[PDB]
């Protein structure tokens, strides 16, 4: 089976600048009878069907803008967008069409570059309603930061806690290009009530020291 | 003109079978093979196989031989894919698409398949009030199935500083939180309400955030 490899997994791009994406095949896709490389590029945006951009490595499909260019040959292929637009922020997949089974790369997602931004962090005790029904979810929001890399650390009574922590990351905001994240520590009411101090700490490249939010029950 | 119209979303239990349809119009059905492609979150795109209704040629990805069956009804210009012994690995968007990459490349809108043992379950909503010029509040939306839910704040009129996070799965049920940021002057002196809707259970929850 032909193995298709794409890098990077995602890329922060400056709108209006050129982007280059790579795809490599485990086998040559060049057919010696017709001198064509059986390699296609697809775009996919969320909730939409894939759209063919490029086939035979370099032929632009109908209705595809001229800023999209495919090149390369054999095992090494490139998709270039000259002057990337906001509408081009999407996932790009290469596909070999050389032999069955047809195989795709794992994709390159284009996200938008913007200025660095520190997260706004806030922590919330379990609601009295949740406690009455025997549960205790302690929620920490890390909102509107850039870039997307962030580390959250929970501490109970000064002690680091790893278990029962569920994290969720938004896709890049389409208005301000930031990322947000939720971190939820789920306990039973009884577990929760055995401790006094709950701390959420976020470390992000925008500061040398963590942003620290806590409460005492 | 050309369309590939797929059947509606499917929600089924583990072990069930499903049969998805793809109805061609605007061209002669027998002129092009219909390929099937799986789009699963974090697993990109995967080719399943094709049926060529003109010559009745069918080919499968080896991985799907024994799992998928491709058929075609020429009288109704419709291609079908059946998947058997479903697991959560089969949860995905399935596309039919026409021909090889090239001039005839054309895709259906996709069919979502969710495989789960969970029962349709409305959300329980819990208010998040704190224990600056701006204040953040939230709602915890716990224990619902299936996706999706929508969360608004004061019926959409609190539009700004809202973040509704992707749900996470826990005990076969979804949980998410939503945050909203408002001026300190406006809360708690003014009422803030999170409005959760769950279409599948026809449920609305309006939870007031009490200090």
């Amino acid at each position: 089976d032909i193995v298709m490899s794409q890098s990077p997994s995602s890329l922060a791009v400056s709108v209006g600048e050129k982007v280059t994406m790579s795809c490599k095949s485990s086998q040559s896709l060049l057919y010696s009878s017709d001198q064509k490389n059986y390699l296609a590029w697809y775009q996919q945006k969320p909730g939409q069907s894939p759209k063919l951009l490029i086939y035979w490595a370099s032929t632009r499909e109908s209705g595809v803008p001229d800023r999209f260019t495919g090149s390369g040959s054999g095992t090494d292929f490139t998709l270039t967008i000259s002057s990337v637009k906001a509408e081009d922020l999407a996932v790009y997949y290469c596909q070999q069409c050389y032999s069955y089974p047809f195989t795709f790369g794992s994709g390159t997602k284009l996200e938008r570059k913007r200025a660095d931004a520190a997260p706004t962090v806030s922590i919330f005790p379990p609601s009295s309603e949740q406690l009455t029904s025997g549960g205790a979810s302690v929620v920490c929001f890390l909102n509107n930061f850039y870039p997307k890399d962030i580390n959250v650390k929970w501490k109970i009574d000064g002690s680091e806690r790893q278990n029962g922590v569920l994290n969720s990351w938004t896709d890049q905001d389409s208005k301000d290009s930031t990322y947000s994240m939720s971190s939820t520590l789920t306990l039973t009411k009884d577990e929760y009530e055995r401790h006094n101090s709950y701390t959420c700490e976020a470390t992000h490249k925008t500061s040398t020291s963590p942003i620290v939010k806590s409460f005492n029950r | 003109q050309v369309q590939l119209q797929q059947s509606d979303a499917e929600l089924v239990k583990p072990g069930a079978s499903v049969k998805i349809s793809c109805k061609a119009s605007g061209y002669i059905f027998a002129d092009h093979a219909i390929h099937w492609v799986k789009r699963k979150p974090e697993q990109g795109l995967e080719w399943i196989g094709y049926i060529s209704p003109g010559n009745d040629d069918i080919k499968y990805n080896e991985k799907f031989k024994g799992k998928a069956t491709l058929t075609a009804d020429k009288s109704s210009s419709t291609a079908y894919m059946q998947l058997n012994s479903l697991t959560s690995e089969d949860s995905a968007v399935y596309f039919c698409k026409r021909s090889l990459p090239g001039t005839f490349d054309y895709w259906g809108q996709g069919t979502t398949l969710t495989v789960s043992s969970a029962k349709t379950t409305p959300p329980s909503v819990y208010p998040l009030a704190p224990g600056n010029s701006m204040v953040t509040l939230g709602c915890l939306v716990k224990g619902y199935f299936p996706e999706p839910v929508t969360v608004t704040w004061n019926s959409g009129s609190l539009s700004s500083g809202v973040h509704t996070f992707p749900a996470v799965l826990q005990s076969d049920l979804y949980t998410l939180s939503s945050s909203v940021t408002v001026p300190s002057s406006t809360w708690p002196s003014e009422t803030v309400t999170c409005n959760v809707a769950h279409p599948a259970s026809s449920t609305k929850v309006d939870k007031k955030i009490v200090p």
């Binding site: 057919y31 017709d34 050389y98 032999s99 047809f102 | 060529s52 090889l100």
Partner: peptide, 9 residues
């Protein structure tokens, strides 16, 4: 076949 469209290999 090369007659009917198919991948080259």
């Amino acid at each position: 076949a090369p007659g009917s469209t198919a991948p080259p290999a």
